[PDB]
Structure 1
Amino acid sequence: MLFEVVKMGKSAMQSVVDDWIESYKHDRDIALLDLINFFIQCSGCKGVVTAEMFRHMQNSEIIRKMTEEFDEDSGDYPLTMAGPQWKKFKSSFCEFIGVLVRQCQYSIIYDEYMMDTVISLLTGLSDSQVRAFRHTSTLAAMKLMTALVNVALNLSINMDNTQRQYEAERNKNERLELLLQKRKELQENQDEIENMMNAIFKGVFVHRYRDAIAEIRAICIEEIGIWMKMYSDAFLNDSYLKYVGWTMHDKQGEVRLKCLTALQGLYYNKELNSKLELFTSRFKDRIVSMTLDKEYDVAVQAIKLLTLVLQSSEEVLTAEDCENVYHLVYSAHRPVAVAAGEFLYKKLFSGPNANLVKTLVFFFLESELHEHAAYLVDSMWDCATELLKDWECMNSLLLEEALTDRQESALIEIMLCTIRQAAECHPPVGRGTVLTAKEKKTQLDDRTKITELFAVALPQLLAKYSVDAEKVTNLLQLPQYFDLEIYTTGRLEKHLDALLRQIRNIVEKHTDTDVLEACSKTYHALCNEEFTIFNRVDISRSQLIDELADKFNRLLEDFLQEGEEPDEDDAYQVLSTLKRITAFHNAHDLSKWDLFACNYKLLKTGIENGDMPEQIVIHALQCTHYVILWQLAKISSTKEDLLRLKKQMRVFCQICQHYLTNVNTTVKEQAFTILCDILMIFSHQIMSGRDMLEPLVYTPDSSLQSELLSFILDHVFIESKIEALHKRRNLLAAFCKLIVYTVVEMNTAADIFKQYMKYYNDYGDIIKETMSKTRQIDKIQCAKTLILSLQQLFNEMIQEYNFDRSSSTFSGIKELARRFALTFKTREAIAMLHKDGIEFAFKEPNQGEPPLNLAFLDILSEFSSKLLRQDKRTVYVYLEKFMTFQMSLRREVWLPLMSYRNS
């Protein structure tokens, strides 16, 4: 009955309590039985307690019989099931226990029958080794207690009122004896309630908060938090706090959170408690260390609690404490960063806003964990939205006049971050997880404020700081965030012209790579041809390039005449100029200038002379790469440009190939990535869309194919630290793209698959994708190369023939072999693998006999697991073609073969 009524139906809760209270009055005994069975069945038990049992058996014996007659299918029980209909259940269960006590608190609860009965059963069940009883009963008992705390509280109040009535009459007959009588009746009532509370606490709580099962421990600590928040005057003292204190050290995150949620509840919204502050002072150390809890969910609540602590008093938190929390602003995980940002705000953030901005810049400068503001900014985005979008303010501190230049740069940095995050509406990478109405509006509002403000301020800004590289690289990124229509309709074209002038002046006095990249990338944004502004800027572009190209030819005259052997100085002159051209040719079309000649003339002259400063080579290489690529774009369209393109392309591949062996290491890398790019670009795939491009297709020699493999083996597989890695993975994927798009013979993958283990953290993820992308391409020749991998590991260990079976080398190859099998038309592959493994095992003969390669079958034995019952015969038939009778008989060193034969 009852168990059904609670989850299954959703009649009111007070309606079912009152019906139960009704029945308790008609017949106490049948109704208390309905209540016993209710708790049993909530545990998942399908047993029934009968009247005869109720009348005659002890709980211990009922509990035993109800374990026997449980009739379970799995180890499932209601409080561990998933779904909304069980979540609805658990809450209806807890609501019923609460509402039952609250509706009994004036009469029934103080009989001697009902609660003592319920308590003993819950106490006995909570002692059970059966988890469904122990878990369920503790929840029940923990709810029961919370209901009982309320009754006590009400009672306390009724005592205080009734005492105020008593005194009012002492001051002024027969109502006196009655008020005394009442005050006495009520004291008797508080006594029965302390007892029931102590029964539950000492009989259940004291044992169960410490249950082996963490889910039970969390239940207990939650409710004790609720008792301390509900009836603080009775429960907020050490003798209940200490539990929460100890449990903060619990080894489970779920339990640790509940200790923090409980505490938060005693500060928010309301408090002022000297018992609480004493405790917190005892456990402050432990709390700030939980700001770096292993569980991130737990670390947020520790910071949020350290924030609430802050409000009541700055007393407890020391310098070093707060400093630790500040550091979490640069955390990978956004929820902790935002909670630390909120703490940071309240702690250190009390025209108007200017002093707050200098404060952030100081904070950013003092913390040595980040060198850019992107994550600092995002942490604060939520709680300091207004201060961050105040661009007029920030703009004024860099111009109108003090500020050290270190401070001017950090404010320039911060300023840009605010803007980008206002303009694009996502967090920085790794902080993300869209996009609502009012967000699109604030976005539009934000771009316009920005565009308008910075159309005018930006030219003055470049002017002021133009000689500093960090600052300009930062400033130059602004226009990429503008709504550009606002240049025409805002009638701002005088400022636009002014901007270009600064950019041009910058491009020409700078030779830093990042400066020139910003310039180039910024000119690209401003040369958009959906905007009226284009033509003004296109002219500005054309003129700067005319100057660069013309100066480039002249430098290339004195530089490449024979008489003058140009020194370190004459060179930089060229480099400086070449960089600017290379930077611009990437982002901008620049076809009109046939500078393939100039670059080619400069690369071929490096080859013959063998002395050409690396940086010139690198940028030459890069530049001619863009020259080729831009020509490939305009193809309306001629065939004399097309046949000439093929010339340059074919020739450039030959240069990149010479430079691939050039003694200079960074030059090799430069020539290698360009090559992997073009090989992919001019691959057979070039024509997939169109067929106009069949003459351009390029397939590399078997010579070039190996050299690209030589490079990878010398430079990716070798014996800031993160820098050298990301470069190497980049070179690796470059070659692997050639593989999984079959620009290069799949055999090459043998020398790369073998490394999946030996470099599993550096290169693991890349190598795995290469293997899948070749399973999806050709399941069969994948499997061929997979064995040739192990074959290569094997022949290598020979030069280090036989043998140590118990070797670390050999044990490692079997390890790698076990892992190539889990990777496994679906069975003709493993067919192909055992064939080649067997063919390889008997490749060379012994000369007194086992053939030399015979150990390979202990490796090949790792794959006989995978497939297959009919195919094992066909494999063995193929094995017999190799193995002889006098072999199948020898059982002495021959063990690999005897091994492989099982399956």
Structure 2
Amino acid sequence: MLFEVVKMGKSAMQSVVDDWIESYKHDRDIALLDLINFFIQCSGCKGVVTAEMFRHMQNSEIIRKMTEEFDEDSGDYPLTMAGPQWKKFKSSFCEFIGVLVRQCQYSIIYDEYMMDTVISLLTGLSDSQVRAFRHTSTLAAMKLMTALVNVALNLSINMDNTQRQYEAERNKNERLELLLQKRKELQENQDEIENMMNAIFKGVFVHRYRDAIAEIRAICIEEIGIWMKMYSDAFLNDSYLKYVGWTMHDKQGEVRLKCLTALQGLYYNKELNSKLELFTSRFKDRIVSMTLDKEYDVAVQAIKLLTLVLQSSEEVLTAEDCENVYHLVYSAHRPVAVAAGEFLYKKLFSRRPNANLVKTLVFFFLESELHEHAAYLVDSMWDCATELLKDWECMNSLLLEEPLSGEEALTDRQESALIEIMLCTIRQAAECHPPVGRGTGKRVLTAKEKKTQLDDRTRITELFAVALPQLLAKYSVDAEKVTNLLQLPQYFDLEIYTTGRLEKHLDALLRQIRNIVEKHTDTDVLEACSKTYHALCNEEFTIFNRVDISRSQLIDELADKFNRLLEDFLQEGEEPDEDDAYQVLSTLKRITAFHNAHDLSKWDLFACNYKLLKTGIENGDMPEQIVIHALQCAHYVILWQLAKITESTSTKEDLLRLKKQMRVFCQICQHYLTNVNTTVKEQAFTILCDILMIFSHQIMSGGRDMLEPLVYTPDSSLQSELLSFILDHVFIEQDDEASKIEALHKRRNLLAAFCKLIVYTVVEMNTAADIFKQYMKYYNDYGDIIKETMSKTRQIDKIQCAKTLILSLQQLFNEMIQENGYNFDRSSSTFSGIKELARRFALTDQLKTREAIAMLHKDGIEFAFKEPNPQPLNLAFLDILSEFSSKLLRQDKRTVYVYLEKFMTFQMSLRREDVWLPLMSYRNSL
């Protein structure tokens, strides 16, 4: 009954234990037998131990009888069995052990009958090959020893108290003699408890801490850590620590984490000398290595343990190991990174107003060649060094003011690192979300977090409204500096400019932006400038007008210059010098950057871009960069005009003008698609895909029937040229590494453009065939895009998608026969790969899918018999089709088999002893 009560009896373990104690008082043997059977049932065994067994039969024999009397229906036993009732049972089982020790700890524990019986039975069960017995008994023995450790600790405390009482009495006769005798009996009790604890440790622990099952090992490791924490003077020794140190090297990560937590307790307690010095020296390298454990959670715990060790002594960790931990702040795993950032903050940034800490952060960021930006570093240390990271005042003072007596002026590289770090901290404070790869960024901000973010944003705005003009002026020549600094206003509250009467500083900032657009020809600088002007041009903020005015002026000047330049550039007799081309190119780059983010349709710049582009088509000496930026600018002109022409009130004839512009520009992009320079073709193809999507049928789908004239259907030549660009550029020969990654990303975006055309029915589905044929070939490079395209095309038309897949397989087949003779073996890796891709396609079936696959099989057999024997050539393709035979239902199989029998008549079905085996295999599959 006891097992049932513990399992779900909903009775306090104290009551259960007290009832068992009453039973022990009435008959000790009967209660002992009930306890033995309790442990047996807790292992899952349905047998019962007899009183004769307990009286004479050895524990090993009893265990064997219980194994044969198990009546098990499965391998599950209560401790492994999942479910809330069994979790409650595990907890109640451990509590029963603890309370049983507690209630007997002053008498029955020293009776030396029930305790010895229990330890004997538990040891025997810990030796059992049966995992249920071993597991349950080991957990019970560890819980029992924890309780015994608490009993022995209380005995030691009480002994110290009686010795203190005797000492007081000796200072001052029968009372002190009483006290001496009480100490004597307490020491006898402690020796008895020590015998019990030694029995459990030497008979169970030293055998189960190295158990084959990882669960058992974890139980033992956790409980030895508990003993060390509970009774440090008696269990915090090398004799006990060695087991944790050894099992730190266990291949299983669960056990490793158990070891780490056990150690964390002791290292938190700050005993230091408590054998922890020797353990640290012995296993320091192991902990440092665990910082890079296969299991990330184990690694975080190891880093936290290293921080604890640092709090204990600091210098013990040495600088090399600290640097190992430092590298982890750049890890993709945010837990590891923030633990390492905490370690790094405590190592040097904690001891320290913040100016030297800011300089040290800059120096650390520069010393670590791992990252080129501080986003992930700042993220790692944002929770720890928030006061330092938010000391923007000290940072911009370091960048601005320099003469500070003995302080050495920062190197230009250090100044760039500092503006980078300042920008990253500003961004993380303005938007309370981590950089990509660390946090989702789409989490509802807490009320506290929203208030903190608002305070940081106001401080940033008011400080840098004045700081940023100065910073931009000081670093106007340096391009990276001005880009990073130009990203700051996007994190400002522009209402602060008006409310805080800072309009003068806004004007200075605007003038600085315009100055650097005039000075700079770098694309990133000009992009940052147009982005900043766009952020500042908010009609809802009061500063709009001012900024807008300045914006207009800039454009005006640029436009005028450009026009003049072009008048000389596009002249009947004007051989362009490299300076002339550079002039027109720089002004064009500025105008393109601003036209992307601003409506420059007032300046009517389509004429200039079109003239440049057609002159590049005719003359053929036009600079490639000029063509690229002119393509982009004409694209933006058309786009902005489309945005304007959305109401009949706006215009009607400009709609026709816009249609003409778009068609002409599409022809120009098609011409530049067939260009020698790959970058020109890439720009034209990119813009062309975006144009085709923007001006597709969907341009009228949502209440935009007035835009119905403004549609462009890709002509067959255009579709062919786009697919040819994909085939020539995206799919290439499969072969520093970061440059390869960048190239792969550009190719993926190109492929995704054409695939967007496919999935949104802008182009024919059949084109996708070629893309689909490269699904396995470029699974890593483009397989995600090909998979998404294939699924979308399935949803569009499953029957037509099946046709395109069979076309891809047919394309692989005749490509194989073109590369290698018709003697190709079925085992040849090429044909096997075609069959593998066919299986993959086949996985992609009663929801009209049966109809589509019937059509697929029809096309397959028609292809097989399309080429007849010269004295069927594509008989082999039947094997390919056999990959899809399984998805075909028997009822539909009859019809497709009728078609197949019509193809081979009857003689062929009989003739299959040699190379006709593919036909017979497909015939069987049917």
Which category of TM-score, normalised to the shorter sequence, fits these structures?
A: over 0.9
User: Given that residues 33 and 54 in structure 2 are in contact (C-alpha distance below 8 angstroms), is that contact kept between their aligned partners in structure 1?
Assistant: yes
The whole-number CA distance in structure 2 between the counterparts of 1:464 and 1:124 is: 81
Deviation of 1:588 after TM superposition, in Å, equals: 0.5
Deviation of 1:180 after TM superposition, in Å, equals: 4.3
SS in 2 for 1:106: coil
Deviation of 1:498 after TM superposition, in Å, equals: 1.6
1:185 corresponding residue in structure 2: 185
Q: Measured at CA, do residues 7 and 358 of structure 1 come closer, stay the same or move farther in structure 2, by a change above 3 Å?
A: farther
Name the stretch that deviates more: 607-616 or 866-875: 866-875
Deviation of 1:130 after TM superposition, in Å, equals: 2.7
User: Given that residues 628 and 683 in structure 2 are in contact (C-alpha distance below 8 angstroms), is that contact kept between their aligned partners in structure 1?
Assistant: yes
Deviation of 1:692 after TM superposition, in Å, equals: 1.4
Instruction: Give a deviation string over 1:166-193, Cα, whole Å, max 9, x none.
Output: 5555677445654444333333322322
User: Given that residues 696 and 712 in structure 2 are in contact (C-alpha distance below 8 angstroms), is that contact kept between their aligned partners in structure 1?
Assistant: yes
Deviation of 1:49 after TM superposition, in Å, equals: 4.2
Q: Measured at CA, do residues 644 and 72 of structure 1 come closer, stay the same or move farther in structure 2, by a change above 3 Å?
A: farther
SS in 1 for 2:875: helix
The whole-number CA distance in structure 2 between the counterparts of 1:480 and 1:87 is: 53
Alignment of 1:71-82 (within 5 A): 71-82=71-82
Deviation of 1:321 after TM superposition, in Å, equals: 1.0
User: Given that residues 354 and 388 in structure 2 are in contact (C-alpha distance below 8 angstroms), is that contact kept between their aligned partners in structure 1?
Assistant: yes
Deviation of 1:706 after TM superposition, in Å, equals: 1.2
Instruction: Give a deviation string over 1:456-495, Cα, whole Å, max 9, x none.
Output: 2111221111111111101111111111111111111121
Name the stretch that deviates more: 292-301 or 119-128: 119-128
Structure 2, unaligned runs of 5 or more: 401-406, 733-738
The whole-number CA distance in structure 2 between the counterparts of 1:596 and 1:42 is: 85
Deviation of 1:806 after TM superposition, in Å, equals: 2.3
Q: Measured at CA, do residues 832 and 56 of structure 1 come closer, stay the same or move farther in structure 2, by a change above 3 Å?
A: farther
Deviation of 1:56 after TM superposition, in Å, equals: 5.5
Instruction: Give a deviation string over 1:215-261, Cα, whole Å, max 9, x none.
Output: 22111111111111111222222221111111111111111111111
The whole-number CA distance in structure 1 between the counterparts of 2:826 and 2:261 is: 58
Q: Measured at CA, do residues 270 and 98 of structure 1 come closer, stay the same or move farther in structure 2, by a change above 3 Å?
A: farther
Structure 1, unaligned runs of 5 or more: none
Instruction: Give a deviation string over 1:314-340, Cα, whole Å, max 9, x none.
Output: 333222111111110111111111111
Instruction: Give a deviation string over 1:100-125, Cα, whole Å, max 9, x none.
Output: 21221111111122112222222222
May I ask how many residue pairs the two structures share in their alignment? Answer: 898
SS in 1 for 2:546: helix
Deviation of 1:97 after TM superposition, in Å, equals: 1.4
The whole-number CA distance in structure 2 between the counterparts of 1:805 and 1:416 is: 61
Deviation of 1:784 after TM superposition, in Å, equals: 1.0
Name the stretch that deviates more: 65-74 or 599-608: 65-74
2:883 corresponding residue in structure 1: 862
1:680 aligns with 2:693: yes
Deviation of 1:212 after TM superposition, in Å, equals: 1.8
1:372 corresponding residue in structure 2: 373
Name the stretch that deviates more: 89-98 or 475-484: 89-98
The whole-number CA distance in structure 1 between the counterparts of 2:315 and 2:498 is: 58
The whole-number CA distance in structure 1 between the counterparts of 2:785 and 2:71 is: 52
Alignment of 1:414-429 (within 5 A): 414-429=421-436
Q: Superposition RMSD on alpha carbons, in Å?
A: 2.0
User: Given that residues 595 and 633 in structure 2 are in contact (C-alpha distance below 8 angstroms), is that contact kept between their aligned partners in structure 1?
Assistant: yes
SS in 1 for 2:602: coil
TM-score, normalization by structure 1:
0.96
Q: Measured at CA, do residues 901 and 129 of structure 1 come closer, stay the same or move farther in structure 2, by a change above 3 Å?
A: farther
SS in 1 for 2:904: coil
Name the stretch that deviates more: 276-285 or 308-317: 308-317
Q: Measured at CA, do residues 637 and 256 of structure 1 come closer, stay the same or move farther in structure 2, by a change above 3 Å?
A: same
The whole-number CA distance in structure 2 between the counterparts of 1:628 and 1:574 is: 21
Name the stretch that deviates more: 791-800 or 487-496: 487-496
Deviation of 1:419 after TM superposition, in Å, equals: 0.7
SS in 2 for 1:763: helix
Deviation of 1:45 after TM superposition, in Å, equals: 3.9
Q: Measured at CA, do residues 7 and 499 of structure 1 come closer, stay the same or move farther in structure 2, by a change above 3 Å?
A: farther
Deviation of 1:9 after TM superposition, in Å, equals: 5.2
Instruction: Give a deviation string over 1:856-875, Cα, whole Å, max 9, x none.
Output: 11121111122223222222
Name the stretch that deviates more: 164-173 or 737-746: 164-173
Q: Measured at CA, do residues 879 and 562 of structure 1 come closer, stay the same or move farther in structure 2, by a change above 3 Å?
A: same
2:597 corresponding residue in structure 1: 587
Q: Measured at CA, do residues 52 and 877 of structure 1 come closer, stay the same or move farther in structure 2, by a change above 3 Å?
A: farther
Instruction: Give a deviation string over 1:19-66, Cα, whole Å, max 9, x none.
Output: 332332233233333322332333344444455654554433443444
Deviation of 1:211 after TM superposition, in Å, equals: 1.8
Q: Measured at CA, do residues 553 and 258 of structure 1 come closer, stay the same or move farther in structure 2, by a change above 3 Å?
A: same
Name the stretch that deviates more: 103-112 or 645-654: 103-112
Deviation of 1:71 after TM superposition, in Å, equals: 4.4
SS in 2 for 1:598: helix
Name the stretch that deviates more: 23-32 or 576-585: 23-32
The whole-number CA distance in structure 1 between the counterparts of 2:187 and 2:374 is: 64
The whole-number CA distance in structure 2 between the counterparts of 1:79 and 1:683 is: 63
Q: Measured at CA, do residues 590 and 46 of structure 1 come closer, stay the same or move farther in structure 2, by a change above 3 Å?
A: farther
Instruction: Give a deviation string over 1:60-96, Cα, whole Å, max 9, x none.
Output: 3443444444444543333334455544442332222
SS in 2 for 1:323: helix
Instruction: Give a deviation string over 1:835-894, Cα, whole Å, max 9, x none.
Output: 111111111111xxx911011111211111222232222222221011132211223211
Name the stretch that deviates more: 48-57 or 526-535: 48-57
1:701 corresponding residue in structure 2: 715
Identity, in percent, stands at 99
User: Given that residues 237 and 274 in structure 2 are in contact (C-alpha distance below 8 angstroms), is that contact kept between their aligned partners in structure 1?
Assistant: no
SS in 1 for 2:128: coil
The whole-number CA distance in structure 2 between the counterparts of 1:395 and 1:103 is: 68
Name the stretch that deviates more: 74-83 or 779-788: 74-83
The whole-number CA distance in structure 1 between the counterparts of 2:11 and 2:667 is: 83
Q: Measured at CA, do residues 584 and 81 of structure 1 come closer, stay the same or move farther in structure 2, by a change above 3 Å?
A: farther
The whole-number CA distance in structure 1 between the counterparts of 2:354 and 2:545 is: 40
Deviation of 1:727 after TM superposition, in Å, equals: 0.5
Deviation of 1:764 after TM superposition, in Å, equals: 1.3
SS in 2 for 1:292: coil
User: Given that residues 530 and 594 in structure 2 are in contact (C-alpha distance below 8 angstroms), is that contact kept between their aligned partners in structure 1?
Assistant: yes
Deviation of 1:362 after TM superposition, in Å, equals: 1.1
Name the stretch that deviates more: 555-564 or 599-608: 555-564
The whole-number CA distance in structure 2 between the counterparts of 1:472 and 1:897 is: 70
1:664 corresponding residue in structure 2: 677
SS in 2 for 1:78: coil
Name the stretch that deviates more: 316-325 or 640-649: 316-325
Q: Measured at CA, do residues 10 and 412 of structure 1 come closer, stay the same or move farther in structure 2, by a change above 3 Å?
A: farther
The whole-number CA distance in structure 2 between the counterparts of 1:10 and 1:426 is: 47
Name the stretch that deviates more: 22-31 or 222-231: 22-31
Instruction: Give a deviation string over 1:607-640, Cα, whole Å, max 9, x none.
Output: 0011111111110111111111111101223121
User: Given that residues 536 and 544 in structure 2 are in contact (C-alpha distance below 8 angstroms), is that contact kept between their aligned partners in structure 1?
Assistant: yes
Name the stretch that deviates more: 295-304 or 691-700: 691-700
The whole-number CA distance in structure 1 between the counterparts of 2:388 and 2:525 is: 29
Instruction: Give a deviation string over 1:377-432, Cα, whole Å, max 9, x none.
Output: 01110111111111112121111992222111111111111111001010000110
The whole-number CA distance in structure 2 between the counterparts of 1:674 and 1:814 is: 38
User: Given that residues 236 and 274 in structure 2 are in contact (C-alpha distance below 8 angstroms), is that contact kept between their aligned partners in structure 1?
Assistant: no
Q: Measured at CA, do residues 126 and 871 of structure 1 come closer, stay the same or move farther in structure 2, by a change above 3 Å?
A: farther
Deviation of 1:676 after TM superposition, in Å, equals: 0.9
Name the stretch that deviates more: 736-745 or 55-64: 55-64
2:866 corresponding residue in structure 1: 843
Name the stretch that deviates more: 464-473 or 826-835: 826-835
Deviation of 1:805 after TM superposition, in Å, equals: 2.2
Alignment of 1:219-368 (within 5 A): 219-350=219-350, 352-368=353-369
User: Given that residues 270 and 312 in structure 2 are in contact (C-alpha distance below 8 angstroms), is that contact kept between their aligned partners in structure 1?
Assistant: no
Q: Measured at CA, do residues 82 and 588 of structure 1 come closer, stay the same or move farther in structure 2, by a change above 3 Å?
A: farther
The whole-number CA distance in structure 2 between the counterparts of 1:637 and 1:36 is: 93
The whole-number CA distance in structure 2 between the counterparts of 1:738 and 1:529 is: 35
The whole-number CA distance in structure 2 between the counterparts of 1:661 and 1:374 is: 41
Name the stretch that deviates more: 19-28 or 338-347: 19-28
The whole-number CA distance in structure 1 between the counterparts of 2:190 and 2:147 is: 14
Name the stretch that deviates more: 880-889 or 37-46: 37-46
User: Given that residues 261 and 301 in structure 2 are in contact (C-alpha distance below 8 angstroms), is that contact kept between their aligned partners in structure 1?
Assistant: yes
* Among candidates 825, 830, 850, match of residue 804 of structure 1: 825
SS in 2 for 1:265: helix
* Among candidates 605, 612, 618, match of residue 622 of structure 2: 612
Q: Measured at CA, do residues 514 and 118 of structure 1 come closer, stay the same or move farther in structure 2, by a change above 3 Å?
A: same
Q: Measured at CA, do residues 191 and 708 of structure 1 come closer, stay the same or move farther in structure 2, by a change above 3 Å?
A: same
Deviation of 1:11 after TM superposition, in Å, equals: 4.6
